[PDB]
Design an enzyme around this catalytic site. Sequence first.
Site, PDB file in Angstrom:
ATOM      1  N   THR A   1      90.444  32.013  38.553  1.00 17.95           N
ATOM      2  CA  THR A   1      91.756  32.116  37.932  1.00 17.95           C
ATOM      3  C   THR A   1      92.826  31.656  38.912  1.00 17.95           C
ATOM      4  O   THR A   1      92.753  31.947  40.109  1.00 17.95           O
ATOM      5  CB  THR A   1      92.051  33.550  37.484  1.00 17.95           C
ATOM      6  OG1 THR A   1      92.048  34.419  38.623  1.00 17.95           O
ATOM      7  CG2 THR A   1      91.004  34.024  36.489  1.00 17.95           C
TER       8      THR A   1
ATOM      9  N   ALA B   1      89.788  43.751  37.543  1.00 17.33           N
ATOM     10  CA  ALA B   1      90.565  43.902  36.316  1.00 17.33           C
ATOM     11  C   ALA B   1      90.863  45.367  36.017  1.00 17.33           C
ATOM     12  O   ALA B   1      91.986  45.711  35.622  1.00 17.33           O
ATOM     13  CB  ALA B   1      89.826  43.257  35.147  1.00 17.33           C
TER      14      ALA B   1
END
Lengths: 216, 240, 247, 242, 127, 273, 233, 241, 197
Positions: free
Chosen positions: A52, A86
Site C-alpha cells: 500500500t 489493520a
Amino acid sequence: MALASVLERPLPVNQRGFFGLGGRADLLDLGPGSLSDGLSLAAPGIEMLHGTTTLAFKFRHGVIVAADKKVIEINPYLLGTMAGGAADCSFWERLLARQCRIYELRNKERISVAAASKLLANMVYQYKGMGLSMGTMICGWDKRGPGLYYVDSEGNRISGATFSVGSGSVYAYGVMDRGYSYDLEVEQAYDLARRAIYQATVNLYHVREDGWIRVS
Amino acid sequence: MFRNQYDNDVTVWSPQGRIHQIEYAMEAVKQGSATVGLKSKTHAVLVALKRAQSELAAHQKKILHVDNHIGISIAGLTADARLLCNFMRQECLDSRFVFDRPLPVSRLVSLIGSKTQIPTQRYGRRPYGVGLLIAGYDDMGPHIFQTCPSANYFDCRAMSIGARSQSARTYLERHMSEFMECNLNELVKHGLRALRETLPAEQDLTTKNVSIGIVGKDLEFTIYDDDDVSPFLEGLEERP
Amino acid sequence: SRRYDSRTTIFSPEGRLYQVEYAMEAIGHAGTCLGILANDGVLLAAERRNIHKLLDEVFFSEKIYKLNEDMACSVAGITSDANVLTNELRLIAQRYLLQYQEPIPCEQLVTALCDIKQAYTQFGGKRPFGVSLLYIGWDKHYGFQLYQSDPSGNYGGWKATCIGNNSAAAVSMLKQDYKEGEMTLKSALALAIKVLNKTMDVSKLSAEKVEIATLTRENGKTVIRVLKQKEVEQLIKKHEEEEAKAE
Amino acid sequence: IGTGYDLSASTFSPDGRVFQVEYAMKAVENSSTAIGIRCKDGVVFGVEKLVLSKLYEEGSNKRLFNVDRHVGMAVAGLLADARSLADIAREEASNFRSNFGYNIPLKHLADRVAMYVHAYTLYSAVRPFGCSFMLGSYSVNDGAQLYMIDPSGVSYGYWGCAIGKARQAAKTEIEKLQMKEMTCRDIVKEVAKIIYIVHDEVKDKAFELELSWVGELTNGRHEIVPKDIREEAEKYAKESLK
Amino acid sequence: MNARGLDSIPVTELDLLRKGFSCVKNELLPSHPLELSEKNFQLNQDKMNFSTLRNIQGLFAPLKLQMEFKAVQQVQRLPFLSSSNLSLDVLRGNDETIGFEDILNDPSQSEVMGEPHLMVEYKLGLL
Amino acid sequence: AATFFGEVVKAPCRAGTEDEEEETPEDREVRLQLARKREVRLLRRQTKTSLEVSLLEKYPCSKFIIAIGNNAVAFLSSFVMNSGVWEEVGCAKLWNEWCRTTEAFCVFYHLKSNPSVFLCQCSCYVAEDQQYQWLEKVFGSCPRKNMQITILTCRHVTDYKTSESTGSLPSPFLRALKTQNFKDSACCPLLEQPNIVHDLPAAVLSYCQVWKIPAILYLCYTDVMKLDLITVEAFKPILSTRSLKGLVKNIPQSTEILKKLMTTNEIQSNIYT
Amino acid sequence: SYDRAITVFSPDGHLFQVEYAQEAVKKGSTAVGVRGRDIVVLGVEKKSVAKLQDERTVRKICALDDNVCMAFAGLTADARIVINRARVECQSHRLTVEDPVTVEYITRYIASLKQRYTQSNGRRPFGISALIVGFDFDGTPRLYQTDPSGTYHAWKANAIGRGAKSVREFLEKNYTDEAIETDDLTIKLVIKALLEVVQSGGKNIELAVMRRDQSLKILNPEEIEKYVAEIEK
Amino acid sequence: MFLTRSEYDRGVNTFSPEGRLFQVEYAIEAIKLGSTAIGIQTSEGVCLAVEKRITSPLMEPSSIEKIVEIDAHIGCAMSGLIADAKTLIDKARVETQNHWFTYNETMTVESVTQAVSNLALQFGEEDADPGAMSRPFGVALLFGGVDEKGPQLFHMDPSGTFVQCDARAIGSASEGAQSSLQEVYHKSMTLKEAIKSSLIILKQVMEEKLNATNIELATVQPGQNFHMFTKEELEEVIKDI
Amino acid sequence: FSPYVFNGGTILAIAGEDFAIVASDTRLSEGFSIHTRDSPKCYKLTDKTVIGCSGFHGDCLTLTKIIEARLKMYKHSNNKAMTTGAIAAMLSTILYSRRFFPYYVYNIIGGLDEEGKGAVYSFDPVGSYQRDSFKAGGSASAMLQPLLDNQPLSLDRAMRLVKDVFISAAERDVYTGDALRICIVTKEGIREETVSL
C-alpha cells in the site's frame, strides 16, 4: 457471614471450599463476568498492509490525501490513514473518535488537530515494545488553519507540509517535492497528487473549512 | 413508652429479646399493591395489579423476567427489587454457563435467603424492604415461593402479598381444592377472581391495570400487558 | 455556643471554627518569645520556664533549635508536639538539599510545615497541634527574614513580633519603639532587653531567666550563636544604669 | 437492673454481667419446643412445628437439618440464624473430611461451632446469635452422643435435652424415663407422647409432629421417620392423652 | 516455609505529571528472583498462619485475628508521618525480633515524601 | 451517631430536657424575626384583611364541625356540604417545615339557610407552638354556653396499643372519646385505656372539657393513610347521629361525587411499587 | 437539630452545613473583578495594615499560569491548598494537550475539587470563594466565580466578600460599553467601585492588571496614588 | 399514659414504625426549591420548556443553561441542586458513547434513563466502593428523545426510579402546572400548540414577566437533531400568546 | 508445552438479496488421527444470524459460550434482540480484548440486516472485519477462493454452486469431513439439512 463482611478485604481463606494450602477455591468462580474492559497480559496469521502507498500534503486551500479501505473517516472534520496492522489502527482510531466526541460534548467546541494527535500518541506510547505496529497521518482544519501530523507506534509525532509512506514512497515524494507550491490552486493540486500517485506505481480526498469531501 | 432506646439499630436486642427494626422493615411490604400467585399440576401463574401516578403517566411494571423458566413479582421498595433481580439474573447466567443446565429454584431461593440474612446482623446496614413471589419450572414441576424482609422463605401452593391481601388469601384458602386439576384457562380466571377481592365493591378490572405471567411444561415465561390480556378477561363474571 | 464544639469539622451558624479557636487559645500560657530584624542581623530572645532548683542543664539550649546551616526556630506551646514539628522541619530541609543541591529558602520551608499543620484541621478524628513557631534565617533571594506561624496553619512575615504570655503589651511597645531602616544589632539587643524587662513582671531580670540567639553573616558564611551569661549580665547592667540615669 | 449498660456486647455491668447476651438467651423462649433423647443405641429428635396457614406445602420451613451423613440437627429461635449456623456446620464437616479423609467426630464439630458462636459476643460491630440447637450422631466405635449449644457459646453433653418455650415441663417429663436401657423403637413413642403433653392448644391453634432418628437401625445415618411409624406414634400419644 | 509464596491491563472505559517513568513491558516480569518474595513476606506469613489455624481449629480463629488487626491498625498517624506500630507488633509477635527491614533503609528517614492532602485522599480511595 | 472511629456519643432523651437546659442584640433580633415568621393570621379572603375579633365572637354559633386530614375533609365535602349553600367567612395562614404554603388550607364556612351552623376543613399541619394561637384566634376568651362540637380525624393503625399483633386487627375501625357534659352516646366503642391522642384534636377536646362545652371526637385507625375510598366509607355510621341527621339528603349522588374525585388524586412519589 | 451533619437533609430539604460554610466567605476582605475588551482587572482591599509587617507575604492575588489569575475571599489557609492544586493541574494539562489551559476548564477543576469535600462526614468543606480571570487561546477575555458548594458561572463584573451587595449595585448602575473603552477607564472603574467601602484609598487597595498576550502585572503605590488623584480631579 | 419524644428521621438507614424512609422523602421535598420545568410528549416530537432565574443583569445567560444535550437525539431538563446534576449528565454522556463504541449503534431513551438511574440507587453504604455517595441526590430530571418506537419522555426521581409520562411538570409550581396540563393535553395535537400551551402555563405560574429572556425552549423532531431556540425564534413564538 | 492445537475445517458463506447461506464440513481431526466424523461447526445465535468458526476446538467452544452469555445480557438490558452488525462489532471488541494472547479461531458471520438483505462478515484472530458478498475460510480457503472468484444468484443456483464447490474441495483436502451441513436464513426463519459426502 456478618463478621467476615465487616473485614473489607476478601481473602481466599474466608471463602467456602477451602482446605490445605489451596482447595476448591480457584475452581469456584468460572462465570463469564458482568461488565468491564481490559487487555489481557502477555503470554497466528495477522493481516498486515504491505503493498500500500499513501500520500498527503497541505497547502493554502486545505489538505489533500490520496491512497490506493485504506483511509479511516474518524469524524466529518477529521481524517486518518492506516499503515501496518489493520486491527490496531482501527481500534485505536475508534478510541480517538470516541475521545473527540466526548471533548466536543463537554466543551461545546470541536477539538484541534494538535490535541487529537497528542492524544493518539499518548495512547499508543504506553505499549512500547509490546508488539504494536501502526503508522498514521492525521488531517484536519481548526481555528489555526490546516494541520497535518504523523504518528506511529514508536512514539514519533512530527508535523510537516508533505508526507509519504508506502512501497513507492521515494518516487512519489520526489515527484511532489519537484511539483510542490504553497500558493497552489485546487485543480493544479489535484493534478499534482494524481501524477505523483501514478508515478508511485485511485482514491482522492480533500479537507476544507466545513468537512472533507470525496473527489474520486 | 420504654421502647425508644432499643429500636434504632439492628445490632441491639430489646429487653424482651426482640429486634424492632426487622419488624419495622416487614411493614414496607404492605405499602405496595396486591399480588396473587398460584399453581396447578402443569402451569404456574402470576397476577399483579398496577397503579399509576396520574392519567398522563404509564403504569409501573411489577412482573420481571429472570430466566427462561423463572419469573418474579414485586411488592415493596424499588431499589431493593432491582438489586435482587440483578443478583438472580447473574446467578442463573453463571449456573447455565458452567453446567449447561438450568438452576433449580430451590437452590436459587436458598442463595437469596443467605444473601439477605447478612444486613440484619452487622452495623451500618438496613434490611431489604421488599417481598417477592417466585414462579418457576424444573424437573420437580411448578413451584411458587415467597420471600420476606426477615430473610425467611416459604414453599407455598397459593399466596398473596401486598396491601389488603387478606381477602385474596381467604378466597384462595376457600377454593384451594380445585387448583390442581384446572388447565391454564380457569386457572388464570381463579387468579383474577382472587385478585378482584382486593378492590372496592364498585369498580372492576380493566385491561390497563392487570399483568399476567405464565410458565409451563413446554411454554417459557411470558408477560401479557395491555391488549394481550383481553382473552383472559373475556369470560369473567360481574363480581358476584 | 456549646453545640458546635464537639469536633473540628463543624461550622458555627456564622462560620466559625471553635476547636481551632480553643487550640489557638492554648498558646497564651507558654513563655514569651521575641524576634527583631536589624540591618546586619536578626535576633531571637526567649524566656526560660524550667527554673526549678533541682533541674539540670545538659542540652545546648531549652527553646532554641537549629534546623539548617542557615535557619533556626523557637517554639511556644506543647513540648510533645514541638518535638515532632522540629524533626519534620529538619527532614524537609534535608530532602530539598538532596533534591536540588542547594539550601532551602525560608518561605518554602515555612509553607511546607504550615501545610502539615493545616492538614489536621480538616480530617476528623485528629487533634490540631497546639504550637506556635518563630523562624529566623538568611536567604540569597531576600536576605535576613523573620516569620511566625500559629496552630490554624497561617503564617506571615514580620519585622518585629512576639508570641506567648503577655504578647499584647510587647507588641504595643514594639510598634512605638521600633524604627524602620535604622536598627543595628546593638540597638535591637537593647530594645529586646527593655521589652522583656517590661513584660516580665515576676521579678527583676537575671541572666539565668532568658536566652538570646544571634544570626549574622560573616565572610560568606552564616554563624548562629547563643549569648552567654557574661554578655547577658553586661546587657542587663547597662540597661539598669541607663534607667537609673533616666531619673 | 442493668439500665445504661445494655446497649453493646462489649460493656460490663457494675456486678460483672453482659446484658446483650442475656437478652439474646431470653429471645430463644419465643419459639416452640424441641426435644432430643439419647438412648442405648441411637438418638431420636422431635419438634413441635406450628402451622401458620393452610396455603403452605407439607415440607415448608422445616426445623430438622442434615449437617452430614451421620449428624442431625434441631433448632429453636430465629430461623435465619438457624440456617446460617447449619451452613457453617456443613462447611466445617466438609473441610475436616477433605483435610483428613474420614468422618469428623461429634465433639470436635460441637467445639468448632460453639467457638464460632461465641466469637460474636465480643465486638460492637455485630450482635449475638438468637438461636439454640442440638447435635446428634452415632457410630459403632463411639456410640450415641448428644450436645447442646446456646447463644452465649457454651456446649455440654446430655442424656436428654429440651429447648424452647416450655423446656421446664419437657425436662420434668423426660426425667421420668430410663433411657439407658431402651431402644429407639421404644423411644419414638415416648418422644411423641411428651411433645403432645407439653403442647398447649389454647394459645396455639394447631401443630404437626416432626421426628427423625439416627442409630443402628439406620446404619449410622440420619433419616426422617417413615410415615407409618409416625402415624402409629401419633395414635399411641393421642390414646395416652385420654 | 513462611517465605515461599504461591489480565490486569485496564483501558479507561469504565494526571501525567503525578506518574511517570514506567512501562508495562518492564513490570511484566521481575528483575530478580527475590524481589516479589521480599516485597510480600509479611502477607505470605499471615496467609500461612491463617491457613494452618483454619485447618486445625476452625473459622473463628483467623476471623478473630483479622478483626484484631483491623481494629488496632485504625489509630495510627496520618500517612505523611511515621508511626510506631507498637500494639500491632505485640499482637503479631514481632516485639522481640529484629529483621533486615529494621536496620536497612529506615522508613522514618526517607528521602522522598509527597503532599499531605494527596496521600490522605489516596488512602481513602478517592484517587 | 458516630462520624469517626471511637467518637464519644450520648444517648437521646425522651423527656426533651437535653435541648432547653442551655438557657448579643443580634441574637434577640433573630429570635424575634423567627417568631414573627411563624405567627397565625386569620383573614377574610374577600378583601385580604385580618379579623381583629375572634371568629366565633362576631357570629353566634350553635353547631361546630371540624375535619382534619384528607379523608375527613373529603368525606365532609362529598356527603354533607353538597346539598346546600355555604358562604366562606375566613381563612388561616400558617408556615412551618411541613406546610410551606397555605392542597394545604384551612377554610371556614357557615350555612346560608341556618347561619348558626358552621364548618371547618383543615388539611394543613399546625405545629405544637401554633395550636394555642389557633384556639385563641378561633374561639377567643369567653366561650358560649349552648354550643356542640364534633371532630373527625384519621390515624395509622400501627399507633394502636393491643396485646396481639397490629396486623391481626380488622382495620379500619372507629373509636370515640367524649367529654363529661356530652349526654348522648357514641356509635362506636370508646377508646381503650393505654391509648392516648395528641395534637390539634386533643387541644380542642382539652379546651371543651376545661370550659364545660359538649364535644365528641371520632377516630379512624386505617392501614392506608392516603386518599382512599375504604377509609372515607368507614365514616358512614356517623350520619345516624343527631349531629349530622339534618344535613344529608342524597346518598347516591354523594357516592358518585366521591368516585369522581377519587380519579383526580395527587401524584405519589415512586418509592414503592 | 438538623444542622450538625454534612449529609443530613432538613425536613424542608436544606443542607445547612454548606450554607454555614458559605457564611464564612461573607467576613473576608472585599474583592472586585471587571472584564474589559483587551484587559482584565482584579482589585482587593486591605482589611487592615500593620506597620511592622511585610506586605509581600500577605497578598491575596495569585497567578495560576501564563494566562490565568485568581483572587479569593475567605479562609486564608484553605485558599493555599486549592491554589497549589490548580497550579499543578494547569501544568499537567499541557503535558496531555499541547494547547494552554482554558478558564472554563480550570474553573471546572476547582469546582470539582471543592465539591469532593462536601460528600462525607469525615471532612469539612473549604470556606473560600474565588474570582478567576484570564484570556483564552484565541484571545477572548473571561471571568468566573466559584462557591464552596461547588458551583460556577460566568459574569461581566462581580464582587465577593464582606460589603459586596453595595459594590455589586454600584457596578450594575455604572457598567456600560463606553466605560470599558480603554485600559485607563477600566482601571478607574475598578478603583471607583472599591472606593465605596474603603475608608481611604491608596493605602487600603491593591490592583493587578493583565493585558492580552502579557503576564500579570502588579501596580505599585505610586501608580495607585496617581490614578486616585486623577479620579479625584 | 404519657407523651414522649421519638426520632427516626436523622439517618439514611432507619425505618419508621410504619416502614417509611424519611431522608428520601426529605430529599424529594428538596426539589420544590428549584425552577419549574415542563415536558410535553407528542406524536410529532418532544417539547421541553424551563424557567431560568436571573439574579443580576451582569450574569451571562448562556452559562446557566438548564437544558443540555445528552446526545444528537436526546435532551435533558434539570431542577433542584445544580451541583448534583452535573455528575449525572456526565454519566449519561459517557454511557452513550461507550455503548456506541462497543455496539456501533445508538442507545434508546429508556436504556439511557436506566443507566443513569443505576447510579442514583447506591447510597448509605460507605463501606462499599470508596466513590459511593452517602446521601441521596437532590435533583430530578426529564429525558426527551426519539428512537425506533417514536418520541419518548421519561421522568427520574431522587429515589432512583423512573417512569414514562405523556406530560410532566417538575419544580416549584409543579402541582399547579400539572393541574393545568391535565385540562389541556389531548393525544391528537401538534407541536405548535404544544409549544403555545406550555408557554401559556409557564407565564401563568412564573412570578416574573415573560419577556423572551428569562425562559429557554428546545425541541427534538424525527429526522432533526436536538435543537434549541434562538432569540429571534423565542420572540416570534412569544408574540401573540 | 504448546497451548495451541490445530484442527481441520472449512467454512463458506454466500449473501443474497433476501437470503444467506452458511455451510461447513463435519470432521474433527488432529492431522493424522480422526477424532469424530460428525461435528458441525455452524451455531445458530438468533432467528436471523448464524456463526461458523474453525481452528482450535477449545477456543471455539469458549467463544461460542461467551457470545451466548453476552447475547442474553444484551436482551435483558435493552429489552430487544440485537442485530447482526451489533454482533459483529461486539465480536471484534471481544477478539481484540486478547491481542497479546490471541484466540486461534477464524470466524464468519452470516445473516439478514435491518432492511432484509443478506450480510456476510469475515474476521481475523485479532478482530479486523469487513462486509463482503461471499467468503471462504478454514484450511482449504487458499485453494477454494480462486474457484469462487472465477465462477446476485438465486437460492437454487447458489445451493448448486455450494454443493459442487465442497464436493470438489473434499477430494483434494485432508481435513474435509464425510458430511456437509447447510443453514439457510430467510424471512420465514431458519432451516438446515445435511448432505452426505
